[PDB]
Design a protein around this nucleic acid. Structure first.
Lengths: 116, 65, 65, 151
RNA sequence: GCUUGAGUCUCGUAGAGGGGGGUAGAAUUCCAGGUGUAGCGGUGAAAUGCGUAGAGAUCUGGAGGAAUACCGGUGGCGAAGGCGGCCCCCUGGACGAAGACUGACGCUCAGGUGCGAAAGCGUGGGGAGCAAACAGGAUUAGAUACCCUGGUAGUCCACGCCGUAAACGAUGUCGACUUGGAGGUUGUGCCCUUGAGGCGUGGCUUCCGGAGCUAACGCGUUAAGUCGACCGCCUGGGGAGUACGGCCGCAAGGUUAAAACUCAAAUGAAUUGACGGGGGCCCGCACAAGCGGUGGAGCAUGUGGUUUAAUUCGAUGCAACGCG
RNA sequence: AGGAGGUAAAAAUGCCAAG
């Protein structure tokens, strides 16, 4: 193992599913866990609780690296956000800084027409 | 958007993204160009704004509170 | 509620990054005229000033650069 | 109902030894308003369990409650579109009252000889939590914990 | 002749007005690579789809096309259609101040000519994202649909064509006159700019409302008020903006535009109801929380049906069926 | 006062009835 101390937690809180990827500072991924992997196939993965267990299931996937300092990068509309950060704080990580990297275009691509 | 405040963290309390978007530009560009329904939903957004401004300046009757 | 160059008269120049920093937010977006109480003439003026200053990298477009 | 939030009843305590919680238990065992028949079953099953348990009557009884006393249960609530099951915490007055019901329906399914023998068998093996009465409590906790996503 | 109408000059101001050429950042997709591990994606829920050939996630690098977040506002400009990043070049119109000038040069306009959203058509490009058609998966009695996964034409550019729209303030243009209030926006004068003020005066614009008008709704100095000039148009509904003919068009079609026959109505605004898979509030063993039943069995009894010489008549969703 | 949301915010199907 490389045993890095400071790392970055990325959170892809989409409307249907949430993906918690913990990387190093450079961006190389170390481990991840989603709401679909924790069970909860269907409507249950779109809830804040499945985001919470996805972050916990990602915390013990990087126990072999000994990360102690996490900077959170949340991205997405989903209900994951304000619950999957609290699961990292209870997991025994020091939250150095939070930021949202939610990709907002400066108006151009045509979005879909969908859902009458 | 970006949050540190650097010493006494203890709690998220991100009003910061709510002070800019938090959903408002993202639950808008989720779909549906429409290209003219903005022009009509902006209009009733203004029409309901100026009607309640006419309403709050027309509350004084008695109503016996 | 307060004012701007309606009293401290100006014909806004984009190179005055000290004054222009007051009229963007922490994410770099232009703050609306309903907040600062700027006259609509000058809000058009500093919108062109900020848009020029973003081009010369004197002001950032976002905070995520 | 719609309007009334009515206060509960006034149960008189048990005549053998004064306890409303046992007195509530004989009502759930009762059928057809025959209370003297049901009290005959309770006392004859509590004494033949207190010999097997060693503990005296009430404390031998109430220890068999916590193995069937639940703590969360599902309810079918609709707020958005289609309806799903939310696990809710059981209020304490209901909590043992739901436990007493699960026992006497488990004892009624028991294939023993008499109701006194049936209920004493069910109330004893629930103190070692192996009966079907605890299996009701385990299966209400499984589907509650399967639906822990809703709170 | 005259100067008020109309116009010219001087000086400024505001503006997504137009045409051309540059360039900017955000994002999507693709391409390549690093890390990394079993899912991702999607939905009411699913599946199709994508993924151990290592996706999704994350990071770096690149290539492309298209649109311009925030400003942004019943804000602005334009004859209308319309027009939003920034910068330059070319260019139109509007408005204001203070004067000067021309001297009725004006208004309207059939035919005519020009402009004219989107879709479409022609030729040549371009093609990220969306997406008719189409395909697959669902849903469903069926589902040629809504929903999902893909996806060609198209959307973009150049140059022609089409010439239509709920092209709408469903309100032709021009002029005059006739109480008010609150705003927005853009000029300008004067005074103590003494300070964001005070006082005026123009242009455009939003809302409310008086008289008046209107069938009513409503309009209400930006009139649907009071008048004048000119133009377009209407004459019951259906047949029908169709047929035929002409003209126009590459075509799709447009434009002009009937009749036979048929009905005694079609329609407008408002009113009281009822209803809504509209909204708010509330109630009832209505649901929920419970307990005991019925539906199975055997009888009792009533009805339907069938049968009979007759099975007397009546009661028939709830509110007939141990009912008269 | 306007703005944003909130276990939450919906959207599964749901045809017909004759003078």
């Amino acid at each position: 193992r490389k045993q890095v101390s400071d790392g970055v937690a990325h959170i892809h809180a989409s409307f249907n599913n949430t993906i918690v990827t913990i990387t190093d500072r450079q961006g190389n991924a170390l481990g991840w866990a989603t709401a679909g992997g924790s069970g909860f196939r269907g409507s249950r993965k779109s809830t804040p609780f499945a985001a919470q267990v996805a972050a916990e299931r990602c915390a013990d996937a990087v126990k072999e690296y000994g990360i102690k300092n996490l900077e959170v990068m949340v991205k997405g509309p989903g209900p994951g956000r304000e619950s999957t950060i609290r699961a990292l704080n209870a997991a025994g990580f020091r939250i150095t800084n939070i930021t949202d990297v939610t990709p907002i275009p400066h108006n151009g691509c045509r979005p879909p027409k969908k859902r009458r | 958007i970006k949050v540190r405040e650097n010493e006494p963290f203890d709690v998220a309390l991100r009003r910061f993204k709510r002070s800019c978007e938090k959903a408002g530009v993202l639950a808008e560009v989720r779909r549906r160009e429409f290209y003219e329904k903005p022009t009509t939903e902006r209009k009733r957004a203004k029409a309901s704004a100026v009607k309640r401004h006419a309403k709050k300046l027309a509350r004084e009757n008695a109503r016996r509170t | 509620f307060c004012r701007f160059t309606a009293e401290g008269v100006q014909e806004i120049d984009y190179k005055d990054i000290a004054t222009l920093k007051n009229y963007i937010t922490e994410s770099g977006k232009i703050v609306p005229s309903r907040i600062t109480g700027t006259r609509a003439k000058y809000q058009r003026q500093l919108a062109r000033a900020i848009k020029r200053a973003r081009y010369l990298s004197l002001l950032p477009y976002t905070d995520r650069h | 109902p719609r309007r009334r939030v009515i206060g509960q009843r006034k149960i008189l305590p048990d005549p053998k030894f004064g306890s409303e919680l046992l007195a509530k238990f004989v009502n759930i065992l009762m059928v057809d308003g025959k209370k003297s028949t049901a009290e005959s079953i309770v006392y004859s099953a509590l004494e033949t369990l207190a010999q097997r348990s060693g503990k005296s009557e009430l404390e031998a009884f109430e220890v068999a409650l916590e193995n069937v006393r639940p703590t969360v249960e599902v309810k079918s609530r609709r707020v958005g579109g289609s309806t799903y099951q939310v696990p809710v915490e059981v209020r304490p007055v209901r909590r043992n009252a739901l436990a007493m019901r699960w026992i006497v329906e488990a004892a009624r399914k028991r294939g023993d000889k008499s109701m006194a023998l049936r209920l004493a068998n069910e109330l004893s093996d629930a103190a070692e939590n192996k009966g079907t009465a605890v299996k009701k409590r385990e299966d209400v906790h499984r589907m509650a914990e399967a639906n822990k996503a809703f709170a």
